[PDB]
Design an enzyme around this catalytic site. Sequence first.
Site, mmCIF file in Angstrom:
data_model
loop_
_atom_site.group_PDB
_atom_site.id
_atom_site.type_symbol
_atom_site.label_atom_id
_atom_site.label_comp_id
_atom_site.label_asym_id
_atom_site.label_seq_id
_atom_site.Cartn_x
_atom_site.Cartn_y
_atom_site.Cartn_z
ATOM 1 N N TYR B 17 4.679 -8.072 -24.187
ATOM 2 C CA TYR B 17 4.949 -8.377 -22.688
ATOM 3 C C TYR B 17 4.179 -9.688 -22.226
ATOM 4 O O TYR B 17 4.446 -10.221 -20.994
ATOM 5 C CB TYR B 17 4.245 -7.076 -21.833
ATOM 6 N N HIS B 22 6.859 -11.271 -15.649
ATOM 7 C CA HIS B 22 6.196 -10.433 -15.074
ATOM 8 C C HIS B 22 4.946 -10.472 -15.113
ATOM 9 O O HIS B 22 4.069 -9.794 -14.528
ATOM 10 C CB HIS B 22 6.776 -8.990 -15.338
#
EC number: 3.1.1.29
Lengths: 196, 195
Positions: B17, B22
């Site tokens: 991630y 994000h």
Amino acid sequence: VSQPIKLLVGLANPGPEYAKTRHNAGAWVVEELARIHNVTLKNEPKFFGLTGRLLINSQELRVLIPTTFMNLSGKAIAALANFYQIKPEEIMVAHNELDLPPGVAKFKQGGGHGGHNGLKDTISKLGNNKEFYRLRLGIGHPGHKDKVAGYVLGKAPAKEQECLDAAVDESVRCLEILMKDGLTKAQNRLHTFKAE
Amino acid sequence: SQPIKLLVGLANPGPEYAKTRHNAGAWVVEELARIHNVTLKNEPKFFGLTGRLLINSQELRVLIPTTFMNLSGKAIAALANFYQIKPEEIMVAHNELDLPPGVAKFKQGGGHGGHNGLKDTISKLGNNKEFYRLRLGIGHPGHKDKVAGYVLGKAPAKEQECLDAAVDESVRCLEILMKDGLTKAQNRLHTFKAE
């Protein structure tokens, strides 16, 4: 009769592109079931996810992989099950299960969310009803609480991913067995499975 | 003289991630901390990685939660409450859909903008929206329903350059904020646009 299931949902994060993360297990089951039945999952913005319809032993089985945030999975499920008038206890949610090791899988009706942000949102957006069915795909439990998100959003090491993939394969067969012989025979097969 | 005691960088944990859009807010914190030679510490009671930076003799605590993004408020509230920091003293750095790559802005207050981290932060801070934001532009996809997939994707290379320039300038302005105050930090930052 004797299989109550009309919607199969496979929970997953909508990215990254790049990664088979433990949190997406449920989606792997729906993708493999669809592939085998020549169903192409199509984006359907109205249901905030990818959808399909299978016909297995002449029972209609709609499939959903939400493409919302995991914590808004309930929005996708409720949108579709409202649309087609499917009840909560007619829905099966396949998902990663911290309570079981890699390579093991189980069917269950109801229960808690167990810190699963997708399950928790599904309970809520179904009018706080827990009595939907689950297909619990074991991914192991990291140990600690605070480490749970990092665990679920990580990629299982390769030997462990084999166990997961074997459990995905058996879960699909047991889903087929469920559509043919009903829930009890399906469980009775799946709960004695153990990868390799 | 300036309002900020806590800088939070919102992020999903893990290697898969780390480079997703994000996580833009954590890039800011990680780069600020690298420049000030501080190694973030894992504090399980705070659901994240934390440190204390000395910048122009101001103390700035930093935090990158390692909860789910949608549970970011757990980390922020646990740390804020421990150190007695109020919402108006917190700046939350985050990816901002309504601004293009290459742009970044300070703001106080406002809604979450569909950002699940911001949403939980508002809720866990007692429904107080009046924390500061460092809004890091990442653009948006063409369709509302693609937004989760969009933010959880990695920006293509040219686009990531713009993002990296805007992270870098945000860091310089955070340093200016601590020396010259918000108004001067803001005037500089809001004329930046990576091209």
